[PDB]
Amino acid sequence: EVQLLQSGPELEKPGASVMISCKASGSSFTGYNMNWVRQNIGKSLEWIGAIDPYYGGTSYNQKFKGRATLTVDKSSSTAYMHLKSLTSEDSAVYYCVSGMEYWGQGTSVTVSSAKTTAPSVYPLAPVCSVTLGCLVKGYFPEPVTLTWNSGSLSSGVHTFPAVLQSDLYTLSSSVTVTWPSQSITCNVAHPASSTKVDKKIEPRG
């Protein structure tokens, strides 16, 4: 089986650079060009370039204005993509693709000036079925995990993809269900900040 194992997520300030790796196994590393492609926050796919790992010849999308450099280490069957002078336009998932046939699992790059920041978690009771909510605001980086009553409320739940704005993430979740007679709590974890918090949803007074 051909497998492409990419390096882990990258978090960098504007103007910094990243170096992403792709460790190929199970096919001929020097037999196919390694291509690199990113998927933008809009979900479009954008090809960055390709390297012939045998002779080291490269081609690049001019859109990158020479900011991207592809290399290989044939000794370790590893291809590399270096991208410099990052801006928020480079926040994306980056893929290596062997011969445009096999894709790696992706490496996310997020461009933000934030240091690790714990979320603030706010219970959202209804205006004075029921729908309740939890707002998870102002955190960095991804991910967080959110559950309702430790996972016991799973149906009727909508947890939304986080969105990055002014360098920090905000996520929300709704649960639809009785209450307030039975307790409803949103459980939020943010591993990076070692935050674990529970917020009971209390009727508004």
Binding site: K43, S44, E101, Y122, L124, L135, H158, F160, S174
Partner: protein, 219 residues
């Protein structure tokens, strides 16, 4: 770029229906070597893209017979003879005749059809916890709707508020094929306290009138 124009961009179908997806290039994809480097990829939600068809019509390893590709020159078609659930996702065509740059089509989202469903809309004033810290987010959920097109606005004392809005949406639900959306308006506490009425206003196929949820800051 050799521009790849894919249509339709959205393709709602029922399981079992066939599907046809078209892709047109801005110049011929015939290579001097006689091959035509037009490929089709599928990206299932939350995964890497996977190759389905290479060089117009060649089925990649493991790709089932219901997928077939055809075409020539500038005009290509991907056919799915009987859509299965595992087929749902976004399809991309791509050319690699003219490299650099390799290019992709914008994608066609193969989506499940279902009956119209009005959004269930819920609005939430700022938590007292947030306000004690000087911030004020108003949240609106618009849940379990179909079809996907929806318009959402915030109004404050009757005026549209655009600044300080963050929206997020879930992919089509595997179980009930509906869409959900969240909209969050963030103000300072001081600015929150100088308006009375906050409204989450939607338009959707399911109602000729706007769908409104509102509260007034004082209760």
């Amino acid at each position: 770029d050799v521009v790849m124009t894919q249509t339709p961009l959205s393709l709602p179908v029922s399981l079992g229906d066939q599907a046809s997806i078209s892709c047109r290039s801005s110049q011929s994809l015939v290579h001097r070597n006689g091959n035509t480097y037009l490929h089709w990829y599928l990206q299932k939600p939350g995964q890497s893209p996977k190759l389905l068809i290479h060089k117009v019509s060649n089925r990649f390893s493991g790709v089932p017979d219901r997928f077939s590709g055809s075409g020539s020159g500038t005009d290509f078609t991907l056919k799915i003879s009987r859509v299965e659930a595992e087929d749902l996702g976004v399809y991309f065509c791509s050319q690699s005749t003219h490299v650099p740059p390799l290019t992709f089509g914008a994608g066609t989202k193969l989506e499940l059809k279902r009956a119209d469903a009005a959004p269930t809309v819920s609005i939430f004033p700022p938590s007292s916890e947030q306000l004690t810290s000087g911030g004020a987010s108003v949240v609106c959920f618009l849940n379990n709707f179909y079809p996907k097109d929806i318009n959402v606005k915030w109004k404050i004392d009757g005026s549209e508020r655009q600044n300080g809005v963050l929206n997020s949406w879930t992919d089509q639900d595997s179980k009930d094929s509906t869409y959900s959306m969240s909209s969050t308006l963030t103000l300072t506490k001081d600015e929150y306290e100088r308006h009375n009425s906050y409204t989450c206003e939607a338009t959707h196929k399911t109602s000729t009138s706007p769908i409104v949820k509102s509260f007034n800051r004082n209760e």
